[PDB]
């Protein structure tokens, strides 16, 4: 699989430091794992930094000049972004991209992105509440049940059902950002109403940023 | 953003659309333009590089041109799959920056309208034990992707403690949203019922829940 594996993102206090890594996978070294691009939630793509070779040279956006340093271990084809004196407005998804030149410049391969959050608020693990199947809202031969994943920071959170066994009928809704600065989301599964007595329903919630893991059994009443 | 694109464009399936990208001599004037497709909550994907060249796997119906300090992305045979944010990119020799357009949101129109499915959940015993109460109103399978939400305590409107998400495209190309009402356990207990009313293209779908104690 031709890909760029990112790491080193996460939550940092204002004024803090992160080192992003971008490891090339499935292709040979050609000095092209060479660009960092970021995207604030809701906003456009903002180019941050690039590196040239074989003679090393760093290029930087005005907004990061002096605070960020691009480098690459050529022998391990790993691109780095050292980020010092991180500001609130540096909060964004950071993509590394393979930068190439034919006639002109283009970025033909992007990492999946890593969320950098710059905030004085510390991480908070979710409270997980069962959304019980209702004794009337049982839509004839089906019932809705789910889990409320309440009051966590920052994103992301993962929800599975019955340890990955249950995928059909599952709808995990995008999170709401509450005024409190904490996220909530709901995961609902539509299931046969005959199975409610017999079949067990467990929502498995994982909040990596707070190292929080909750299994919540969802039963009627 | 240093390059200027229209915020949004739209057309019905099978038709064609153009997305302009406006710049200056130091960027588009003297350098090659790339176009990036971004689907919601995923990494950008290269469609077009060197003004007009398609990346491997990208079909002919996607085309790019450049004229002076402007670039154009053309999309024919419009599919619902083509709904995405489109960004032009180039080099700016004045600032020595890679630069981007602000992005253009492409909408595919004339898809069949559908009213929202609403499921309303009352507060869990467990949450009430924690001296909290959240009503969860879950709204799915509506098109176009816009709804208004109104919460009632018995018959009377309630504005306070409402948190609603923006609509988001599901995997079946219809939209989903959630609304949460925060209450005290005392507020939840003191009323006969609470309602989530969802209005979509002039029709209201309502769900009601009551304290079962
Ligand atoms: Cl490379």
Q: How far is CA A15 from the centre of its chain?
A: 22
- Starting from the edge strand earliest in sequence, which strands make up the sheet with A18-25, in order? A3-7, A18-25, A78-83, A68-73
Q: What residues of chain B, 13 to 42, have a C-beta less than 8 Å from chain A? A: 31-34, 36, 38, 42
Write down the residue that tokens 């609130």 correspond to.
A88
In units of Å, what resolution does this entry have? 1.9
Domain residue limits, chain B: 8-108, 117-209
Rounded distance from Cα A60 to ligand 1 centre (Å): 20
Architecture of the domain made up of A3-118 = Sandwich (2.60)
The two beta strands, A10-12 and A114-118, are parallel
Rounded distance from Cα A47 to ligand 1 centre (Å): 19
Architecture of the domain made up of B117-209 = Sandwich (2.60)
Q: Which residues contact B49 (CB under 8 A, 6 or more apart)?
A: A100, A102, A104, A106, A108, B32, B34, B55
Q: Taking CA atoms, what residue in A is nearest to B54?
A: A108
* Residue A89: burial class (beta carbons within 10 Å; 0-12, 13-18, 19+): exposed
User: Does A54 sit behind a cis peptide bond, omega within 30 degrees of 0 on the bond before it?
Assistant: yes
HEC profile for chain B? Answer: CCEECCCEEEECCCCCEEEEEECCHHHHHCCCCEEEEECCCCCCEEEEECCCEECCCCCCCEEEEEECCEEEEEECCCCHHHCCEEEEEEEECCCCEEEEECCEEEEECCCCCECCEEEEECCCHHHHHCCCEEEEEEEEEEECCCCEEEEEECCEEECCCEEECCCEECCCCCEEEEEEEEECHHHHHHCCCEEEEEEECCEEEEEEECCCC
Structure tokens at B40: 């919601």
Structure tokens at A161: 């059902």
Rounded distance from Cα A50 to ligand 1 centre (Å): 13
Domain residue limits, chain A: 3-118, 127-217
SS3 A163: helix
Helices and strands, counts by H and E, chain A: 0, 19
**Are B178 and A171 within 8 A, CB to CB?**
no
Beta partners for residue A101, in sequence order: A105
- Count Cβ atoms below 10 Å from residue B77 Cβ, excluding itself: 13
Q: Taking CA atoms, what residue in A is nearest to B128?
A: A129
Burial string for B122-156 (b: 16+ CB within 10 Å, else e) reads: bbbeebbeeebbbbbbbbbebbebebebbbbbeee
- Cβ-contact A204, A161 below 8 angstroms: yes
First-to-last C-alpha distance (Å) of chain B = 56
Burial string for A166-191 (b: 16+ CB within 10 Å, else e) reads: beeebbbbbbbebeeebbbbbbbbbb
**Are A148 and B136 within 8 A, CB to CB?**
yes
What method did the depositors use to determine the structure? Answer: X-ray
CATH class of A127-217: mainly beta
Cα gap A176→A180, rounded to integer Å:
11
Equal CATH topology for B8-108 and B117-209:
yes
- Cβ-contact B21, B28 below 8 angstroms: yes
Beta partners for residue B36, in sequence order: B46, B87
Cα gap A150→B117, rounded to integer Å:
23
**Are A46 and B119 within 8 A, CB to CB?**
no
Rounded distance from Cα B204 to ligand 1 centre (Å): 55
Q: How close does chain A come to B210, measured CA to CA in Å?
A: 11
- Cβ-contact B2, B16 below 8 angstroms: no
Indicate which of A42, A93, A95, A104 best probes the interface with B, i.e. most B CBs within 10 Å of its own CB: A104
Cα gap A97→A33, rounded to integer Å:
6
Q: How close does chain A come to B30, measured CA to CA in Å?
A: 10
Point out residues after which chain B has a gap (C–N over 2.5 Å): none
- CATH pick for B8-108 out of 2.60.40.10, 1.10.10.10, 3.40.720.10, 3.30.1490.110: 2.60.40.10
Q: How close does chain B come to A179, measured CA to CA in Å?
A: 8
- Chain A positions touching B130 (Cβ under 8 A) are 127
Equal CATH topology for A3-118 and A127-217:
yes
């Amino acid at each position: 699989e031709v890909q760029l594996l990112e790491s080193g993102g996460g939550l940092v206090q204002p004024g803090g430091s992160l080192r992003l890594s971008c490891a090339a996978s499935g292709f040979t070294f050609r000095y092209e794992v060479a660009a960092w691009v970021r995207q604030a939630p809701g906003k456009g793509l903002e180019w941050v930094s690039a590196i040239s070779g074989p003679i090393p040279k760093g290029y930087y956006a005005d907004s990061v000049k002096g605070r960020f340093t691009i480098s690459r271990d050529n022998s391990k084809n790993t691109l780095y972004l050292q980020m010092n004196s991180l500001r609130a407005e540096d909060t964004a998804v950071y993509y590394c991209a393979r930068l190439r030149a034919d006639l002109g410049l283009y970025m033909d391969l992007w990492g999946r992105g890593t969320l950098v959050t710059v905030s004085s608020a510390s991480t908070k693990g979710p409270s997980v509440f069962p959304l019980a199947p209702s004794s009337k809202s049982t839509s004839g031969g089906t019932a809705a049940l789910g889990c409320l994943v309440k009051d966590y920071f920052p994103e992301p959170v993962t929800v599975s059902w019955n340890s990955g066994a249950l995928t059909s009928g599952v709808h995990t809704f995008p999170a709401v950002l509450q005024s409190s600065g904490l996220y909530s989301l709901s995961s609902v599964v539509t299931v046969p109403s005959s199975s409610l007595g017999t079949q067990t329903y467990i929502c498995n919630v994982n909040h990596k940023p707070s190292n929080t893991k909750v299994d919540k059994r969802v039963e009627p009443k | 953003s240093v390059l200027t694109q229209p915020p949004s464009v739209s057309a019905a399936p099978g038709q064609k659309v153009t997305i302009s990208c406006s710049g200056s001599s130091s960027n588009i004037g003297n350098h090659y333009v790339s176009w990036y497709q971004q689907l919601p909550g995923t990494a950008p994907k290269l469609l077009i590089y060197d003004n007009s060249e398609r990346t491997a796997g990208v079909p002919d119906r996607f085309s790019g041109s450049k004229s002076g300090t402007s670039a154009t992305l053309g999309i024919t045979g419009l599919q619902t799959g083509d709904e995405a944010d489109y960004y032009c990119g180039t080099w700016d020799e004045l600032t020595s920056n890679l630069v981007f357009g602000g992005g253009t949101k492409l909408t595919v129109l004339g898809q069949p309208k559908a009213a929202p499915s609403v499921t309303l959940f009352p507060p869990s015993s467990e949450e009430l034990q924690a001296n909290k109460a959240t009503l969860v109103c879950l709204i799915s399978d509506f098109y176009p992707g816009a709804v208004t939400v109104a919460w009632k305590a018995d018959s009377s409107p309630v504005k306070a403690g409402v948190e609603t998400t923006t609509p988001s495209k599901q995997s079946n190309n219809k939209y989903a949203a959630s609304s949460y009402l925060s209450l005290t356990p005392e507020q939840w207990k003191s009323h006969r019922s609470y309602s989530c009313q969802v209005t979509h293209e002039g029709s209201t779908v309502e769900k009601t829940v009551a304290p079962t104690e």
